[PDB]
Design an enzyme around this catalytic site. Structure first.
Site, PDB file in Angstrom:
ATOM      1  N   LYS A 176      52.270 -10.284 -26.254  1.00 53.90           N
ATOM      2  CA  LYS A 176      52.339 -10.035 -27.674  1.00 53.90           C
ATOM      3  C   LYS A 176      52.166  -8.523 -27.940  1.00 53.90           C
ATOM      4  CE  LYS A 176      50.932 -14.737 -28.882  1.00 53.90           C
ATOM      5  NZ  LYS A 176      50.122 -15.623 -29.801  1.00 53.90           N
ATOM      6  N   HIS A 187      59.404 -17.046 -32.355  1.00 56.43           N
ATOM      7  CA  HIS A 187      57.958 -17.201 -32.330  1.00 56.43           C
ATOM      8  C   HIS A 187      57.374 -17.514 -33.734  1.00 56.43           C
ATOM      9  CE1 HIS A 187      53.728 -16.755 -31.481  1.00 56.43           C
ATOM     10  NE2 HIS A 187      54.034 -16.878 -30.203  1.00 56.43           N
ATOM     11  N   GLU A 203      55.317 -25.809 -29.808  1.00 56.15           N
ATOM     12  CA  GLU A 203      53.929 -25.621 -30.245  1.00 56.15           C
ATOM     13  C   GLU A 203      53.844 -26.011 -31.724  1.00 56.15           C
ATOM     14  OE1 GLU A 203      50.882 -25.277 -29.916  1.00 56.15           O
ATOM     15  OE2 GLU A 203      49.941 -23.500 -30.797  1.00 56.15           O
TER      16      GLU A 203
END
Ligand code: NA
Lengths: 270, 270
Positions: free
Chosen positions: B16, B114, B189
């Site tokens: 990240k 993301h 996720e």
């Protein structure tokens, strides 16, 4: 001196997303090449060039600058910029670039609020301001792009009034978020134009007035550049240089000989 | 083979915006270090590690991988990813990263969509799809992050139905935009969780079914990973590995010894 002092004239080369890595390495090596006569010791204190490559080539760009500096004994020959950054130091922000990391790579300047980012991504005044603040926290000079968002009316005072007031809304949150002693560079380009020097001169004069009204006595220095795509002849013979503290070079500047030609133009105007 | 073949198990380290450049260089040099026993020749065809640094360190990361490869005679030891890219090859897109340039730097994979980009920047399904298409045009494997956008209800069939259908809306534009022979990796996720293996297994099984229904016979291979933050023990003893083709490692993975520990876990499960 938390920040580099700003010369009276700034020339900026932003590569946007135009260049491959090998072309960027060749390019910066061309800028530095002494036989190319682009970077003169005699210009050091009056005229400064910034290269603004894409994020991927900031590292080898920084490496090239260093290697060139090691040719002499200990103004940098060339400033290195980034085209954007995030509004926080480090953290869970996938795909984002840290001003901490930029500074560690000897970036001195960060271009923010470009028209392309404002149009494509909806980047807001608040976000550009927070971005400027985070860049300044790391000793980076914010370079904020500003300009009117509307097609202007046909009454000149109305048009100039609008354009300046639209720039005011972009400038104010930035100055509010920045320390009063941090330098800031604003690059003006009327977004609806996609170069009229009369128009630029008039709106830039209204910009400097706007800044003086918000914070007349701030210690951090301010520079206003032309952010539009400037071609050969516009600075001197076109009178642009009488209005602004510098400019972004247009795509002619992809050729090193073009950059050489424009540095000569600028030298002559001083 | 326009694309690298995909092993059965994928481990991904995304840094990240957490790491400084020197920490990223030390880190990838730790991954490659043979005494660290993270990258084993005996694992080559079954298990693959990807490092996904920030844009600034892709270059020296790529350089480190090369230097290590030159220690042996001519699967790469380690894949290099980027955390995002633009949806066009080259052009006037200030602050954006080109998949052309990524490929020139031996990036093999691009993380897209993301949750952090979808939440902070409003990144849309259409944009992630166009991004995947542009990454695939350059021989890059899209790694698309997917997951339900809602807090789910208390009736399990309703909850699983929603989550899968919300993933369907993210998957469909990507498969439509990609060539049928280009590989794609989806990382799941549930966005509302900020690890229940029962929940993951159930939604991932609904994801694979969704994909088979859209394009049962596409030649490009597909992998589904866990995109959540996985800790030690979750893969094997926690049963996560029975459900997915790999995972993103959580922040424990910032320590090289942590990565070593999890590779051992994964080896044992196979
Ligand atoms: Na970005």
């Amino acid at each position: 001196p938390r920040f580099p002092p700003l010369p009276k004239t700034l020339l900026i080369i932003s590569l946007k997303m135009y260049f491959t890595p090998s072309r960027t390495i060749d390019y910066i090596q061309g800028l530095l090449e002494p036989r190319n006569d682009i970077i003169r010791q005699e210009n050091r204190s009056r005229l400064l060039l910034a290269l603004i490559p894409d994020f991927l080539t900031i590292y080898p760009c920084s490496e090239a600058i260093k290697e060139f500096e090691s040719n002499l004994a200990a103004p940098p020959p060339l400033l290195l910029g980034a085209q954007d950054c995030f509004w926080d130091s480090l953290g869970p922000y996938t795909g984002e670039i840290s001003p901490v990391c930029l500074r560690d790579m000897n970036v001195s300047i960060v271009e923010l609020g470009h028209a392309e980012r404002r149009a494509i991504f909806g980047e807001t005044d608040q976000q550009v301001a927070r971005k400027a603040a985070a860049a300044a926290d790391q000793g980076l000079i914010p370079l904020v792009c500003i300009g009117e968002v509307s097609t202007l009316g046909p009454i000149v005072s109305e048009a100039i009034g609008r354009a300046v007031g639209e720039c005011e809304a972009q400038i104010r949150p930035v100055l509010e978020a920045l320390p009063r002693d941090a330098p800031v560079i604003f690059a003006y380009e009327p977004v609806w134009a996609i170069a009229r020097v009369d128009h630029v001169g008039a709106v830039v004069s209204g910009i400097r007035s706007v800044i003086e009204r918000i914070d007349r006595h701030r210690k951090g220095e301010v520079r206003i550049l032309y952010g539009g795509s400037a071609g050969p002849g516009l600075w001197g013979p076109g009178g642009l240089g009488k209005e602004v503290d510098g400019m972004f070079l247009g795509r002619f500047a992809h050729d090193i000989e073009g950059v050489r030609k424009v540095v000569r133009e600028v030298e002559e105007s001083l």
